Symmetry: D2
Subunit: 287 residues, 4 copies
């Protein structure tokens, strides 16, 4: 079979994007990485130097098959949208075709139609500030990068997808219950993402027969998580202590659920927020 | 190597229990049926006369294999719970080891420990009456058979299940939003079942490292559905017209989700209500 | 001009029923108490000896006025439901007209139609046991007394209530999120009560133009709370430490919300679970 | 008592802002209107010409006491934020001090500290487009005007509010369930508003002892509603046909709930989305 999945939001092997790639790879899905330009050249260097080799082993027989790796910035819908400062940036200057539309066109031109799409990215320039102290520009940046990027990804990628294709993104329970520390409008962006997942499920389901769901993951010590204010150290310790299942949450635990939601096995599931967090979301009072 | 599942609530090939059996069988899980004594002998006679042979065809290069078929009544926790009248009733008189504790013991004696458990049953004497007109006895009957039966199944089966085992039941969205026609306290029972799934997830996760979830299924023209009164024809027509995914909901659509939730692929999911209903639950206003 | 409220579930001045009585009395609503026969004679003796006189002071320029105090047992729908044993029991033998239908009739005969109804009661034989260890009989007892009693109260009282009347009950968040210690099927009963509030809102709204809602209250050191085992001290301490509003939750805090929901001011609200808990329900992770 | 309420988002007498003003006026609350500059001069003219006189009657005794009416644009946090095109606009040119911070300063300078705040506004330049066809600028405009404006209002107004003050905004159930027609990212903005209400409740409750809630209203034929694509004619007809309570939803039905949430009567309620919609949100299947 010719399953191809574009994963937008891989920067190294420590986040959920990598775990999803690994699990899809087990099912013989061809994988294309969309890599944020500021970290693209570093990623390629680490890859070439074999830094990721142990992380690519699926088992005794299998290694991750990575079809391609492309620069991708969810800040920009089309070529016209890139500002002067960015195009002049040292790191963007030597790259091209990294807007959402350009990446869709490039994948389709090289490999044809795909049938799986993963949104595994977020950004918020004021994450370290409380919501109350977040500026209009800060808040809108969170929503632009973390929420609107999903809509744009759908809008441009549906043209290059087969009927019965499937899309997932990643969210966090701070959208629904208060997590002090989860600042800069990230909580807001995740609330919008979960709502948009429903509305998009209606549009994509009726028009194209395409499904879209979102996985609400528990805490993982990824690069981005490090940026929140040992906030991640706290979250992990609390989850491992109080969740119904006292076991370390792995990126591939989210990967196996993603793989299921992206396969035909879940053909009757759409518009849903699925919790993959060892059950922590169900608890009220710590015991 | 030895995935075994007990499916409590199969009476024919037209309901969700059969769809779950078929999909599990696809994955080489050995299946044991728990059949309610009022329908048990008709079920066995049909099976023996080859009435289900076509329904057991997976892909015509593969057919379902069933390990065992056992009389089972989720009304009774232990042998000591069985009233003299039932014990001597025409349909129960020839059967043995059909209470929850007895079937668990029997299964263990014959096959050892199991790792998958499916609650696919419900009942309510007054389902034809709206909630407001449901009697105390009718309401308690619905809770007893449809909700408490899950707790009891858990209590007795956890002793014959391996750590990391998984349990699922089936629910309906009338627990959360009003569905006229879903009467007799069935809505109440499903609300209880969904809440008990969380509390059980806590106890079973912490004490035995066992997971439990519930699938909120869309409408299927099963024998039980037809007996509600027609109600099910309206539900199905409405769902096929207004759901994000306008496709016929199959018992095997539920089956494949059940299969995922019972497998190790869903190891970080517990306490959850997972909707498998073509996304109908996400809609507010029709078109 | 003739607001009359029946409050089912008052046994002393330390619970939510009293707080609701006090706030309604503030608004010149006439109040009728429904008192469970095991505590009825001790309640009346305390009242007569002036034990509640201080507790009846509203602002020391105003004191509660109580229209009537009636023996009431929400276990029994009609006189024909009362087993011979209860009928002849030491505490029931001297009382009459204490079933749901009889109290409705009595109230109507004496005061005519009423327009406000409060369900402020719960009970569960096995509340000290975790759900997994709760017996069938214990679980059904919790559903019978704590959830079904609301449906029955509605069925019999709608005949003695005016159109545009309002009904409220009390619930707890353990229905939606796991609270260790809230056992015996009380969590199940509250999940059922909250679901039944919606279904009843539909029937009562459409057929009688009557509204029904439920208040999910935070912790209060009532007699029933103390009897759970300590559990309530932990709940209160936790709530005062971690709730958005760090202030002592009063029975009259619930009372003033109840008063609003029972008045015409809330005429467009029905079927709802309203949280009155200093906002604790909105929190995920503590500080 | 000196209760003062600023209501941001009044353009005429046909929306929810006016109904909230009317009901607060009954409680002798002094009212200040924040009026969007494009409609400020028209509003003032209609007011002066007596167009609103019949709409201001509370009853036999009372007329609405409007303390002041000020231009207010939720697009701009501070004086510096206004762009050239706006400052040059015919309608803005003759007005001043209409940014969020400027209005806070102006109210405080004229009247001192207030204790009630109402956010009753929304805008989305692409509301007529499906979410899938909404542009990045369109989507962010919705979030900026409809969601971030609430945060900014809180940030600047808390300085001029008393302890134990209360804040409300208005939302719609399209945040939670799909409403085709509710386009341009308005669904997204409302999801973010409901989430932000929780996070702000935590910050404002712990730091200032101030409460914040949001009212999810049913459909009302306001000026803004007219802009959605007879979408409002449909919504109203559907609500009056299918809601549990079959009665016309009035602006003052939302006003009376707002008045309660803004008063001390609701001191234990914060971070909540309260539905004031005749119960329509509780229904799954039309009957
Ligand atoms: N790590 C957790 O604890 C956790 C919990 C719940 C949800 N999530 C979600 O999972 C997703 C993946 O994050 P992660 O935890 O794997 O951290 P991560 O750093 O591994 O992944 C985030 C990636 O997004 C990329 N990115 C940032 N801005 C971008 C832009 N403008 N365009 C394109 N890419 C951009 C970064 O390069 C980074 O590689 C995020 O959406 C996050 O919200 C994470
Ligand atoms: N059919 C639907 O449309 C639908 C939609 C949502 C959820 N569900 C749920 O799926 C489950 C299966 O229902 P179905 O639709 O497959 O109908 P079904 O008739 O196929 O399943 C019901 C089975 O449960 C068995 N049963 C009843 N009482 C029992 C008892 N006391 N002990 C043991 N077994 C008993 C019956 O023998 C019957 O075979 C139910 O719990 C139902 O609530 C069904
Ligand atoms: N106390 C809390 O912390 C708390 C928190 C959330 C919800 N609630 C709810 O508030 C309600 C009132 O409880 P409370 O905390 O005021 O305790 P309480 O003791 O004041 O109220 C319970 C009352 O119900 C009566 N009752 C019990 N069984 C009855 C029956 N069969 N018929 C008639 N009356 C019966 C008892 O006489 C008792 O007076 C309960 O439903 C409870 O679930 C309480
Ligand atoms: N009308 C309904 O059916 C309905 C249902 C649910 C929720 N709501 C909500 O109620 C609130 C009030 O809307 P309405 O229905 O009364 O319509 P409305 O037109 O009466 O009120 C909206 C007001 O917001 C103002 N506004 C728009 N952009 C602004 C800006 N940038 N700065 C300041 N003010 C601005 C407009 O002048 C207008 O007067 C809205 O938030 C809406 O989402 C309305
Ligand atoms: O522990 C919970 C947690 C940890 C990390 C997360 O990802 C991000 C958080 C903030 C930002 Cl700016 C970017 C990203 Cl990828 C997240 O969403 C939730
Ligand atoms: O269309 C929705 C639907 C149809 C059938 C269902 O199953 C039952 C419903 C009532 C009773 Cl008494 C027993 C059973 Cl198995 C159900 O739960 C939901
Ligand atoms: O702290 C939360 C809390 C405390 C008390 C409660 O009331 C009861 C709890 C159990 C039983 Cl059996 C009877 C009643 Cl009235 C309750 O519902 C929740
Ligand atoms: O019927 C539901 C409904 C009707 C009107 C509404 O208000 C708006 C809707 C869109 C825009 Cl751009 C601005 C506003 Cl004030 C709304 O929120 C929901």
């Amino acid at each position: 079979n010719e399953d191809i999945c574009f994963i937008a939001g891989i920067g190294d092997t420590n986040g959920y994007g990598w775990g999803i790639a690994k699990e899809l790879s087990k099912r013989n899905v061809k994988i294309i990485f969309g890599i944020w330009p500021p970290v693209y050249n570093i990623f390629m260097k680490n890859y070439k130097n074999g830094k990721f080799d142990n992380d690519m082993i699926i088992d005794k027989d299998k290694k991750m098959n990575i079809l391609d790796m492309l620069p991708f910035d969810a800040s920009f819908d089309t070529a016209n949208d890139i500002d002067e400062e960015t195009k002049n940036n040292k790191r963007y200057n030597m790259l091209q075709n990294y807007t959402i539309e350009d990446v869709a066109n490039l994948i389709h031109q090289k490999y044809g139609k795909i049938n799986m799409l993963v949104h595994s990215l977020a950004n918020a320039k004021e994450v370290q500030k409380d919501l109350l102290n977040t500026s209009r520009k800060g808040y809108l940046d969170a929503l632009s990068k973390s929420s609107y990027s999903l809509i744009s990804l759908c809008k441009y990628f549906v043209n290059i997808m087969k009927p019965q294709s499937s899309i997932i993104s990643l969210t966090y329970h701070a959208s629904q219950k208060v997590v002090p520390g989860y600042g800069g409008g990230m909580s807001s962006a995740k609330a919008a993402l979960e709502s948009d997942t429903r509305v998009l499920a209606y549009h994509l389901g009726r028009n194209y027969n395409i499904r879209i769901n979102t996985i609400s993951a528990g805490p993982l010590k990824s690069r981005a998580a490090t940026a929140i204010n040992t906030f991640i150290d706290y979250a992990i310790e609390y989850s491992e202590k109080y969740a119904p299942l006292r076991q370390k949450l792995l990126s591939t635990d989210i990967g196996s659920v993603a793989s299921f939601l992206l396969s035909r096995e879940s053909r009757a599931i759409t518009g849903q927020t699925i919790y993959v967090d060892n059950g922590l979301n169900i608890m009220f009072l710590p015991d």
